[PDB]
Amino acid sequence: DKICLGHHAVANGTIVKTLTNEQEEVTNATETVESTGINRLCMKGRKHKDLGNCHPIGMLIGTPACDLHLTGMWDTLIERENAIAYCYPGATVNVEALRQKIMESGGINKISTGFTYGSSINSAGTTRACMRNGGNSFYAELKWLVSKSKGQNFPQTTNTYRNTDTAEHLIMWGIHHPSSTQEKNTLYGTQSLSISVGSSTYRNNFVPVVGARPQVNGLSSRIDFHWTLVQPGDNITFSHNGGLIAPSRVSKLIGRGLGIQSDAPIDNNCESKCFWRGGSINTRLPFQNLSPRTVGQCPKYVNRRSLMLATGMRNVPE
Amino acid sequence: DKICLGHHAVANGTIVKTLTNEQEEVTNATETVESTGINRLCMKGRKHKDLGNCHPIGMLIGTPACDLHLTGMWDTLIERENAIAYCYPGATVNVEALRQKIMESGGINKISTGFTYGSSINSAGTTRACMRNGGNSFYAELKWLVSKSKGQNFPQTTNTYRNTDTAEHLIMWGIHHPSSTQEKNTLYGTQSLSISVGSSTYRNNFVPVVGARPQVNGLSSRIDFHWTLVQPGDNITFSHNGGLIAPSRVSKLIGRGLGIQSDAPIDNNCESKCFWRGGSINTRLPFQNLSPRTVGQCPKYVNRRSLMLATGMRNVPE
Amino acid sequence: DKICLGHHAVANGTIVKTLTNEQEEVTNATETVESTGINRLCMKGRKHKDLGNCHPIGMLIGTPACDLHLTGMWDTLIERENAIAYCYPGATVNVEALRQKIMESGGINKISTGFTYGSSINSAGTTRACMRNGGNSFYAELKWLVSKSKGQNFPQTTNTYRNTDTAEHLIMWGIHHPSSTQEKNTLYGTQSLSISVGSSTYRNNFVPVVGARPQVNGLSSRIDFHWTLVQPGDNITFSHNGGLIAPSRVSKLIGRGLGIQSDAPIDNNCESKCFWRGGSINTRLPFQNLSPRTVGQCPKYVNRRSLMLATGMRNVPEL
Amino acid sequence: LFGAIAGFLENGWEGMVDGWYGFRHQNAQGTGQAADYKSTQAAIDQITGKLNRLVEKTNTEFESIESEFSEIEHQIGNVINWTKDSITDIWTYQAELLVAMENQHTIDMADSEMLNLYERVRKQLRQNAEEDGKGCFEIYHACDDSCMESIRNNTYDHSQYREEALLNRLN
Amino acid sequence: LFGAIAGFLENGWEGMVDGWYGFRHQNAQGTQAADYKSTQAAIDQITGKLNRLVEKNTEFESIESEFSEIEHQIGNVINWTKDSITDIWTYQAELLVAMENQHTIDMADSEMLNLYERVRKQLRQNAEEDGKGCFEIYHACDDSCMESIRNNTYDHSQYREEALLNRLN
Amino acid sequence: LFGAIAGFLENGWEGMVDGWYGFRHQNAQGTGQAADYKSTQAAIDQITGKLNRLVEKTEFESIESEFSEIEHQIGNVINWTKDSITDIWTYQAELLVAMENQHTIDMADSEMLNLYERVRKQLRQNAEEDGKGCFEIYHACDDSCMESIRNNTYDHSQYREEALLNRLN
Ligand SMILES: *[C@@H]1O[C@H](CO)[C@@H](O[C@@H]2O[C@H](CO)[C@@H](O[C@@H]3O[C@H](CO[C@H]4O[C@H](CO)[C@@H](O)[C@H](O)[C@@H]4O)[C@@H](O)[C@H](O)[C@@H]3O)[C@H](O)[C@H]2NC(C)=O)[C@H](O)[C@H]1NC(C)=O
Ligand SMILES: *[C@@H]1O[C@H](CO)[C@@H](O[C@@H]2O[C@H](CO)[C@@H](O)[C@H](O)[C@H]2NC(C)=O)[C@H](O)[C@H]1NC(C)=O
Ligand SMILES: *[C@@H]1O[C@H](CO)[C@@H](O)[C@H](O)[C@H]1NC(C)=O
Ligand SMILES: *[C@@H]1O[C@H](CO)[C@@H](O)[C@H](O)[C@H]1NC(C)=O
Ligand SMILES: *[C@@H]1O[C@H](CO)[C@@H](O)[C@H](O)[C@H]1NC(C)=O
Ligand SMILES: *[C@@H]1O[C@H](CO)[C@@H](O)[C@H](O)[C@H]1NC(C)=O
Ligand SMILES: *[C@@H]1O[C@H](CO)[C@@H](O)[C@H](O)[C@H]1NC(C)=O
């Protein structure tokens, strides 16, 4: 008469790592590193905006590509690889800082500057480089100011925008840089050009400079874009001679949102809190090996294919 | 006839987490996360400077609010909310880097630049915007240089500061941006204005940005500030034409100290090594959840209310 | 009759820390923090370049100090303390960005710009501040353009560099800042000076500015250097009328390399994957306490002299 | 380590698919097998306790500091690279240690639950059985199917069989 | 887990304020004393852990202004870094107590079992285990004898013949 | 902890030089000592598993110039980040060694106890524990017999009848 104590075993067992052994066999184990991701931006439950080929900067200045994204509300903002910011070629100062501010916002309202110009000014410059409805056009939120009489000196002008709102406003403008002496003369006159801009928190001077350059979108001219934040109650003033690309509206960034740069198409029928370039990560696991670049609420990135956590005893086969 | 082994238990036991059990009851436990901090700045054993409504930048430039803080020694420097840096409209270029230097320092000495000006220069000008006692004053460490004869060209002028010491000196200066072409011509003449500033390491040039006609708009009289370090044995020269707000003294940051931004009342009776916006943390514990923003020798911030460490066995009551 | 069980023990045990006891004697233990490094740069297995007194920036513009370092291939680049970048005194905009790009690289090729100037420009200007063979010279990759007729207006000029390659090129130029009106007028004339530079992806413009300054290598004037990357297939154009220090060659950074700043002598007979200001670290250990600033594949730095890992049982000697 | 699993117990029983630990008996009317539910649930519960902690993580919201589609300034780019790689080195190391540590514990915990079952039966059998060293208990009295069961139940009263058992043991 | 606390010992003793581990009585005259050495062993190991916990630090300065604006891009890098560090420390702190606590509990279990074991081996062939943590002693064991068992001075061979014949009869 | 090393065994054997664990015996032929190879290997193999883990092994580049000025704000961020990374590693390094050492010690303890348990069960009713790690054997056990104990081939049935008689008289 015997009675014997024992444990179970399984025919085929899993190998895991311990402190004292790299090849320990156990009855069972699960993964702790996530390896599979969704190939979709899972936007269900999110007021998301997919920008398409509109670059965030273009929403502020009103590049044609961004006509559907001039104002709106969102809690998630998606930027795409092919995104266009400039139709009229140029560049923006502190552009990455401006992009990040836009990509952290929860929306944009637009507000008129109310700028008006005397009769010696043509405030409606257009160009082939900015087609809007099959016709020559220009940045929606800016006005290209040139002399109404082709070779004459652009008049000394002053324009002031008053932020009468309770939140700060973001105002942008441009400085035209002609590609020839003749072009400068026809647009603004032979006079020396000077453009200065000021608020309680900003003071600066700009001078259009002629220079030969490669054509971009057909033009050898450029615009330098600048921006600043006009505080509540504060006044910003433009004093100018020709060359100013003037704001017709200003921007107000509202609330907060999650910015995402991605390749993946949107799925509005699935939910996620973690995003990367290739889509979404939905997992309960603490670690992931898909990408070191994620935004949102994510498992930590680790340099490991697999990390098995034992869920059973040592497997001791018969 | 027996002998029985056992262990103690307690009427009311404490709950802790283990690898395998949230809610494990133990006879005793102590907290590892400090959740209460002292609401004062504990300054016992620290030679310290409470700056009050003096902003660190105002120390170098000599704003009226900072008159009692133009020099000193300290191992701790305390900055307060809404401290005044400027009395005249304008701002400092590269201000956070400079504020951090001041707030890392162990004291300040001032050294006269020795600058002297010809008879065609008036350097005693003052302004309503910087009141001192009941009268028009100016930044104490600077001088506003204007043409003695109103409307005439401010003379081509050279001033040189020589650092003859064994440590680096911090020199600040200002640039006047007049409110209009008429104010500019009054103060400095009709000539084009240039301020160049050059040492062995540093070169830079400045042109006053003249504003435009209504005084309440964004383009009016302001003074913006600039700074650099002059190394031992190096000289720094100002060549200027009108528009320079020239230093009458330079600064020497001395030693090292701990900088604190807080609105908490100083308490000279208790000691501390860790500070935050609410005043102080005095704990032996390794973690705290009071604030993610602390300076000093601090417990690490964690996003948890409580982490109890068992100090006894499982509690097993009858 | 009896049989007794037991465990070994040793005369001299060593102390380790445990979770519950910081003075636990054990039979044996082993170190986990490395505390000694080699005080040489161990370069065996590496095609390396020691810049000596040549600063990385000077490789791009051709300071005399860098004449033996204008082109090359390397997987390891070594910068020395006090290396010289500039002969003609000046500074570079975003210098540290540029210094790191070079220190990340695995070589530099030089490609000529082919710039030519008309009969009114002197391209061969030299100075007492840059010497070769003990005589006046200038940066090897740049050219100081002045008026051939002293005091007369430098002609409005255009020069264009075309990147016909498959890789981005790094172009550097200078802007001259004279020390007096008199000097400025002699070199470039009385006219207003303007220099604009433009690619498909870069636009900037510059004005020479006159001003009294201390003498550095005997000169009160300065050169500000500027740089940009020119993409393959793109052209960059210089429009100028006095003040441009013009590039005669552009640079191509090639591949990837490890940059090291150290003044430790080089040793070609030992190898290493970890470096710091004074030497190399060869160790199997996961932690080190030599330096918080290391470069390469390195053990993690820890603020401790010693962490003994037990490699045996409690030592229980007979009492 | 506790000495039973991969220890004095030769191997596991692939045929016990009803629990982690159990009994095999041999008496007059044949042999039997039966899993012990308490001990297996102790072990399973402790495992699921670890799995809960593994998934009981909850997340800070991070935003982007690296452009996926545009050049970042070179120096801030290098700082961000150094920081991100340093963070990752820490996590890779935390994940490796976590799992190595947790697995060691899990294995020894299971060994411990085996040993505690074994020890309870021993004390239960008192002076009526002897250990064979390979995990069995040789019972020195007639132990019927309903006796065996009393051993698994914890019903077994040793004093009921003590006289008989001591007799056969001493002879 | 060792066998004893929350195991074959049904429960703890609230009346034992004398120490963590101990003995209870039964003889003619008979009825509790705490064991000093095993209690100390336990407490000592707890205070070792407390010593490591309060072990303390690098000096940190401020890298974000409480009272003014920081540049947007460097501000974001600083935000990302700090939250990353915090996620690490939060994880470490939770791991630290969970793991330390597991070990404290088992360590304590361990000290209980070692005392029990020492008494077992002491009693040799004069006692039998009841499975609830008791030793039923087969000879008369008065207060002085019981003290010799706690005091680790009990001599089994002095009682052994009396004990054996009571055990076997 | 397991109760043997620094426990019910009074001290280690300095003169046991080719094993971590072993046997000392006493019989008519005199005394002797022998190491047990398997238990010492199980202890040793586990240590070298830890050492293997410790020496397993990202390329990093410079982000602060040894030899030139670094901008002040970015420099403070770098100093703050680098110090925060060093605090994490310093903590981890100390926690690693502390945890590892605890476990190595306790592991060694248990390999001693398991050897001790293997021999107990093998001696069955033919020996008795004296509480200090010795088994008092109640029959003659010559050098050949001792080796069968160390061998794990000792057959208790061959001496049982005699052993029981000697334990009771
Ligand atoms: C970068 O610089 C390049 C060189 O200037 C630019 O390519 C140049 O662009 C111009 C105008 O767009 C082209 O000019 C025309 O050339 C034809 C004759 O072409 C044939 O002969 C030339 C000369 O031997 C040969 O190189 C060509 O491959 C053709 O076989 C004339 O009939 C026209 O009147 C006019 O002069 C240049 O040909 C072209 N050069 C090259 C090498 O392509 C380029 O556009 C600049 N890039 C940017 C982005 O601006
Ligand atoms: C700072 O200025 C002083 C004079 O302006 C320079 O010093 C003179 O230096 C020369 C060269 O050694 C000596 O011959 C003179 O005796 C010095 N004069 C005095 C009164 O010091 C000095 O070289 C300048 N420093 C720099 C770096 O330019
Ligand atoms: C294997 O482990 C997983 C993870 O807990 C669990 O779902 C499953 O039941 C285990 N399977 C086996 C073989 O028991
Ligand atoms: C802005 O302009 C309005 C209207 O002139 C005026 O009330 C206000 O004082 C100005 N703001 C400032 C700060 O000057
Ligand atoms: C930063 O590191 C990533 C990883 O390899 C790489 O894509 C990128 O080019 C590096 N960026 C910089 C600043 O050179
Ligand atoms: C950084 O985060 C803080 C805290 O949430 C916030 O107030 C500030 O806006 C953020 N900075 C940036 C760059 O968004
Ligand atoms: C950074 O810290 C180091 C090392 O203590 C120091 O020498 C240097 O001053 C510090 N940099 C800044 C920005 O303070």
Query: What domains does chain B contain, in order, with CATH numbers?
Result: 1-46+265-318 (2.10.77.10), 47-264 (3.90.209.20)
| Cα nearest neighbour of D72 on chain E | E73
Could you tell me the two tokens for C110? 């030089």
For residues E146 and E151, what is the distance between their CA atoms, to the nearest angstrom? 9
Distance from Cα F76 to the centre of ligand 7, integer Å: 7
Chains that touch E (3 or more CB pairs under 8 A): A, B, C, D, F
Whether the CB-CB separation of E33 and C3 falls below 8 Å is answered with: no
For residues F121 and E68, what is the distance between their CA atoms, to the nearest angstrom? 76
**Contact yes or no for F107 and A20 at CB 8 A:** yes
Whether the CB-CB separation of B317 and B9 falls below 8 Å is answered with: yes
The tokens 């200078």 sit on which residue? C174
Could you tell me the two tokens for A244? 């100013």
Query: Among C16, C19, C304, which would you mutate to test the E interface (most chain E Cβ atoms within 10 Å of its Cβ)?
Result: C19
**Contact yes or no for C237 and A211 at CB 8 A:** yes
Q: Are strands C2-7 and F21-27 parallel, antiparallel or unpaired?
A: antiparallel
Residues of E in contact with F102 (CB under 8 A): 103
Distance from Cα C183 to the centre of ligand 5, integer Å: 45
Residues of E in contact with C22 (CB under 8 A): 48, 51-52
Could you please report the per-residue DSSP string of chain C?
-EEEEEEB--SS-EEE--SS-SSEEES-EEE-EE---BSSEE-TT--EEE-TTB-HHHHHHT-GGGGGGSSEE-SEEEE-TT-B--SS-EEETTHHHHHHHHHT-SEEEEEE------TTEE----EEEEEETTEEE--TTEEE-EESSTTSPPPPEEEEEE--SSS-EEEEEEEEE-SSHHHHHHHH-SS---EEEE-SS-EEEE---------BTTBS-EEEEEEEEE-TT-EEEEEESS-EEEESEEEEE-S--EEEE--PPEETT---SEEETTEE---SSSEE-S-S--EES-PEE-S-S--EEE-SPBP----
**Contact yes or no for C303 and E103 at CB 8 A:** no
Q: A–E: how many Cβ contacts below 8 A?
A: 10
User: What values do phi and psi take at C165, rounded to 5?
Assistant: -95, 180
**Contact yes or no for F49 and A21 at CB 8 A:** yes
Could you tell me the two tokens for C121? 């420009």
Among F43, F2, F16, F44, which Cα is nearest to C10's? Answer: F16
| Cα nearest neighbour of B223 on chain A | A203
**Contact yes or no for E117 and F80 at CB 8 A:** no
Name, in order, each residue with C-beta under 8 angstroms of A297's C-beta and a sequence gap of 6 or more. Answer: A273, A274, D59, D60, D61, D62
Residues of D in contact with F77 (CB under 8 A): 79
Residues of B in contact with C216 (CB under 8 A): 200
Residues of E in contact with D62 (CB under 8 A): 80, 83-84
∠ CA B144-B150-B151, nearest 5°, is: 110
**Contact yes or no for D8 and F58 at CB 8 A:** no
CA distance F50 to chain E (A): 19
Helix axes D74-125, D145-153, angle to 10 degrees: 130
CA distance A220 to chain D (A): 23
Distance from Cα A311 to the centre of ligand 3, integer Å: 7
Ligand 3 pocket test, pick from A30, A308, A315 with the greatest ligand atom count within 8 Å of Cβ, gives: A30
- Closest ligand 3 atom to A29 CA: 2
Distance from Cα A162 to the centre of ligand 4, integer Å: 8
3-state SS assignment for residue A144: strand
Could you tell me the two tokens for D94? 């935390």
3-state SS assignment for residue D76: helix
**Straight-line distance from the first to the last Cα atom of chain A, in angstroms, rounded to the nearest whole number:** 24
Could you tell me the two tokens for C209? 């500015």
For residues F104 and A158, what is the distance between their CA atoms, to the nearest angstrom? 81
For residues D40 and E47, what is the distance between their CA atoms, to the nearest angstrom? 34
Polymer length of chain D: 171
**Straight-line distance from the first to the last Cα atom of chain E, in angstroms, rounded to the nearest whole number:** 37
* Segment (H or E) for B157: strand B157-162
- List Cα–Cα distances, A168 to A163, A252, C38, C136, D26, in angstroms: 8, 7, 58, 58, 86
For residues B257 and E56, what is the distance between their CA atoms, to the nearest angstrom? 21
**Straight-line distance from the first to the last Cα atom of chain B, in angstroms, rounded to the nearest whole number:** 23
**Contact yes or no for A214 and C235 at CB 8 A:** yes
3-state SS assignment for residue F85: helix
Computed on alpha carbons and rounded to an integer, the radius of gyration of chain E in Å comes to 27
Residues 228-287 of B with CB under 8 A from A: none
Query: How many C-beta atoms surround the C-beta of residue A37 within 10 A?
Result: 22
For residues C142 and C137, what is the distance between their CA atoms, to the nearest angstrom? 11
For residues C165 and B304, what is the distance between their CA atoms, to the nearest angstrom? 57
Whether the CB-CB separation of C147 and C292 falls below 8 Å is answered with: no
The burial of C262, by beta-carbon neighbours within 10 Å (0-12 exposed, 13-18 middle, 19 or more buried), is given as buried
Evaluate: CB of A31 within 6 angstroms of ligand 3: no
* Segment (H or E) for B309: strand B308-310
Could you tell me the two tokens for C285? 């250990």
For residues D10 and F8, what is the distance between their CA atoms, to the nearest angstrom? 28
Alpha helices (H) in chain A, listed in sequence order: 56-61, 95-103, 181-188
Q: D–E: how many Cβ contacts below 8 A?
A: 57
Could you tell me the two tokens for E102? 């597991």
Whether the CB-CB separation of F167 and E160 falls below 8 Å is answered with: no
- Ligand 7 pocket, CB under 6 A: F 72, 75-76, 79
Whether the CB-CB separation of F139 and F165 falls below 8 Å is answered with: no
Polymer length of chain C: 319
Q: A–C: how many Cβ contacts below 8 A?
A: 39
Could you tell me the two tokens for F45? 């193999």
**Contact yes or no for E72 and A100 at CB 8 A:** yes
**Contact yes or no for D49 and B303 at CB 8 A:** no
Q: Per residue in D119-154, is it b (16+ CB within 10 Å) or e — as a string?
A: bbbbbbbbbbbbbebebbbbbbbebeeebbbebbee
User: What values do phi and psi take at B76, rounded to 5?
Assistant: -135, 130
User: What values do phi and psi take at E146, rounded to 5?
Assistant: -65, -40
Residues of F in contact with A21 (CB under 8 A): 46, 49
Evaluate: CB of B216 within 6 angstroms of ligand 4: yes
For residues A253 and E72, what is the distance between their CA atoms, to the nearest angstrom? 14
- Closest ligand 3 atom to D47 CA: 5
Evaluate: CB of D78 within 6 angstroms of ligand 5: yes
User: What values do phi and psi take at E87, rounded to 5?
Assistant: -60, -40
Elucidation method: X-ray
Evaluate: CB of B234 within 6 angstroms of ligand 2: yes
DSSP letter, residue B12: S
Distance from Cα C37 to the centre of ligand 1, integer Å: 60
Residues of E in contact with B103 (CB under 8 A): 61-62
- Closest ligand 4 atom to A200 CA: 13
For residues E15 and B7, what is the distance between their CA atoms, to the nearest angstrom? 10
For residues F110 and F116, what is the distance between their CA atoms, to the nearest angstrom? 9
Residues of A in contact with D34 (CB under 8 A): none
The sign of the torsion formed by the CA atoms of C147, C151, C157, C159 equals positive
Distance from Cα B295 to the centre of ligand 6, integer Å: 18
For residues A275 and A269, what is the distance between their CA atoms, to the nearest angstrom? 16
- Closest ligand 3 atom to A30 CA: 4
Evaluate: CB of A237 within 6 angstroms of ligand 4: no
Q: Does C89 touch chain B (CB under 8 A)?
A: yes
Among D51, A233, F115, C173, which Cα is nearest to B216's? Answer: A233
- List Cα–Cα distances, A194 to A176, B182, C308, in angstroms: 11, 17, 71
- List Cα–Cα distances, C226 to C157, C171, E126, in angstroms: 19, 8, 96
CA distance E16 to chain B (A): 6
Strand partners, E71: none
For residues D46 and B167, what is the distance between their CA atoms, to the nearest angstrom? 65
Among F19, F3, F25, F16, which Cα is nearest to F137's? Answer: F25
Nearest ligand to the C-alpha atom of residue B214: 4
Residues of E in contact with B295 (CB under 8 A): 60-62
D1-171 carries CATH number 3.90.20.10: yes
Polymer length of chain B: 318
Whether the CB-CB separation of A13 and A27 falls below 8 Å is answered with: yes
For residues A223 and A86, what is the distance between their CA atoms, to the nearest angstrom? 9
Q: Are strands C287-288 and B41-42 parallel, antiparallel or unpaired?
A: unpaired
Evaluate: CB of C123 within 6 angstroms of ligand 1: no
Nearest ligand to the C-alpha atom of residue B199: 2
The sign of the torsion formed by the CA atoms of C39, D75, C100, B201 equals negative
**Contact yes or no for F46 and A21 at CB 8 A:** yes
**CATH topology classification for E1-169:** Hemagglutinin Ectodomain; Chain B (3.90.20)
The tokens 């545009």 sit on which residue? D70
Among B219, B55, E71, B84, which Cα is nearest to A200's? Answer: B219
Nearest ligand to the C-alpha atom of residue C234: 1
